[PDB]
Subunit: 151 residues, 6 copies
């Protein structure tokens, strides 16, 4: 449970606006373990499979267009309930309901524009991960504060 | 509604406790547009002009007085929904009902000493706008990353 | 009640994990006054004395042994509502239930490691307060801004 | 001397790249007073005037145009040695030479865009203040902490 | 010489204009360990017995006075060379010639209100230590990150 | 020269001590471009090859192993003068000679644990880039603020 993982990617806006050091910031202070991460451009292919379940809903292609227009940071975070906790850490997908203190609350205003992405479920989490990252990609180490964070 | 504007002014107590950089930075990083700004001391008739609705109310002149005791930072901000979002940002007029994360929540204790104020309505917005500034103090320009905030 | 005081100790985990400054600051910038502060390793007897009402819980022994593992930072903070406002500042006891922007909410994850302690109640405040420090360790001073803070 | 002042302007670039709040807080937390401050599109004549010691510089006119490009933030700050100290604040003129800690060190890279301008002599100082600001635009007040800053 | 401890005291001005947090934080983040710490109003003799080496000098009793005008934060920190570095950390005694990025650089203006003090030597540092704390107030623990600090 | 590039890697020690968002963040506000990054553990022979030179120097062996003991953040950054400006932002190889305001200065103390590495030549830059990156791993975009960062 304490090993639960999630997939975090900072969208193209986040990277254009200078948010990566910030965003990351928030996860490492939270006490979470950066399992993996890589900066890159997403292929249309990728995205669509990513967003496969969305395939239909109007924004879709724009969405794909957009994810495609710039680089992103893809990463994987490990921890107790990272999935649900980080979700929270990020705010409501529509920045307008995100409160302050949260990724989107603090940093942004429009949904299309929401600078970041998080796995809504541990499933989404697994698929997502595996889809983004080969397995040997995903590092395994122990944080010194482990036993400070973890009971 | 992406042009929306509200009247944000930091109170002499924000001013005095050294909360201006912080506060504008809030707006800055959420991506709203600073339209106008001017550090000034306020006229009693202007306040008065402004605090108009609370005209009597037991705190009324205690207020006015206070609001007049120091210089303030008057500003105009713009963005999709800034009025409402701003509010949010600010917190709950009553700093005890303001959650951490938000300005008041973050840095102040009582409602008398509330560090800032914000248009609570659009119509409201403008009036204060019109009221506090001369339609020529309002700079029309675009953000460099507007395309990153807006689709 | 602007001289309500409260007791806040920064557990061994908040120590080991460097949040001694982050934590204090929050206090400082809100508008509280630090009253007494001390860095020590609480004895067990102290410990038990402390956490007396949970004398019964399954985790009790547990509590106490970690709380004695390392140094803590005890402190008295006074201000208007200190007590109850210091807790919203803290967030949920269970770092998972605790929003962003709060201390827990932002820097920790398990309730067995939830880095800070806050009095829940004025009398507990009282109680702890006394249980932790002799009467004359509590410094008395006024704040220069105190009247920027308080009306 | 501790009532010496200097003229602080934030370049359109500082305005573009959101460093308003940040640069402001720099002063605030250093211990300087905000005498005055407003957001404006400077004019070309003001400009030329404002930058006459440079009337015969390859850049000039480019220097103009650029500064005329967007709005800026004009500010006057007072304090003991504001003028000079303010300048170490800034860093060098050429961001390349600017140490980290400084405003130019920290946020910028090129001379042709170095977000900020500091007065370099008290004369220059008042000269510019003169030039920019309407005496009635200069704030008379006292920090609740003046005591705490000054001996 | 990694268990070299130095005495760092934040002055009435530190305490007054909220930099106790900020201050403790810088030391945190550089990886020194907080051995002892206590919020206490000094005692004229102690002040005396301390600033004994500048018994005569202009200031002196000006110094003593001030340093007792409020409480102070007493601290002991450990780390390889903490002293020298602490100093460095601190700034040049004189707010005047202290670079940005140092304690003083960033938050203070005159040598009269120099928000904190730190040992300037070992020999010194001990004398102060002895002098401001009883032995048992000296917290020995092992930081987790320590071997991440030290090879 | 606006396209120069450097190799920045954050060492395991910096990763163990949550200083990644901070480290990146330093690069991002200055306004330098993130060109490639990935999280990962380095291969012995990746490392021996990277420190190839000081193949002899006593430290070599310990260096290796250390570097190998946990994951790193490997990056590439582009901007006018990134290589030189990038070192200056890092500071002195020896944290002890590092100034406050700099990454090491601020964040670490012993050479052996210096948390990060920056390209010392532009050759080295390009060389180090090789070793470490597959050319296709070099993303290419244009920051929306470049024109504000550069003339
Ligand atoms: N432009 C635009 N994008 C949207 C809209 N609704 C959702 N999206 C995008 O689709 C992403 C994923 O949709 P959803 O899963 O429902 O949110 P997520 O689970 O947080 O990924 C959101 O984060 C948005 O960036 C919309 O109405 N307009
Ligand atoms: N002393 C005092 N001032 C108050 C009280 N309620 C409101 N105010 C002040 O009057 C301001 C305006 O209140 P309100 O109309 O609720 O907010 P606005 O419409 O956003 O300015 C508040 O932000 C406070 O500064 C009160 O109970 N006591
Ligand atoms: N391991 C563990 N510790 C707990 C649990 N519930 C509470 N505690 C711990 O003991 C302290 C006292 O608990 P409680 O009275 O609920 O929390 P409070 O409202 O923060 O003081 C908490 O701050 C926790 O560190 C639990 O279910 N398990
Ligand atoms: N393009 C360009 N602008 C320069 C150069 N030198 C100075 N300036 C610009 O004109 C301003 C005024 O120059 P000067 O008075 O030396 O510098 P200041 O008084 O230190 O900051 C600088 O802040 C730059 O923006 C140069 O070589 N090229
Ligand atoms: N008012 C005043 N205080 C001074 C002066 N020089 C030094 N002091 C004070 O005395 C303290 C100690 O003297 P010194 O050893 O020279 O300071 P250090 O370098 O902290 O140890 C300083 O921190 C100052 O607050 C001076 O010219 N005027
Ligand atoms: N233990 C130890 N490590 C050192 C020493 N000198 C350098 N190193 C380590 O090896 C690295 C590379 O040294 P060097 O090539 O001179 O520095 P670079 O090329 O400027 O950054 C540094 O990051 C240090 O951690 C030393 O004297 N002792």
């Amino acid at each position: 449970a304490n090993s639960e993982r999630t997939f975090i990617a900072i969208k193209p806006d986040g990277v254009q606006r200078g948010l990566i050091g910030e965003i990351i910031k928030r996860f490492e202070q939270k006490g979470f373990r950066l399992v993996a991460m890589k900066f890159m451009r997403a292929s249309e292919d990728l995205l669509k499979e990513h967003y496969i379940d969305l395939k239909d809903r109007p924004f879709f292609a724009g969405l794909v267009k957009y994810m495609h227009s710039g680089p992103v940071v893809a990463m994987v975070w490990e921890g107790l309930n990272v999935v649900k906790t980080g979700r929270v850490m990020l705010g409501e997908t529509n920045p307008a309901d995100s409160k302050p203190g949260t990724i989107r609350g603090d940093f942004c205003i429009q949904v299309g524009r929401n600078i970041i992405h998080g796995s809504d479920s541990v499933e989404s989490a697994e698929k997502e991960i595996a889809l983004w990252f080969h397995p040997e990609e995903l590092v395994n180490y122990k944080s010194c504060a482990q036993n400070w964070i973890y009971e």
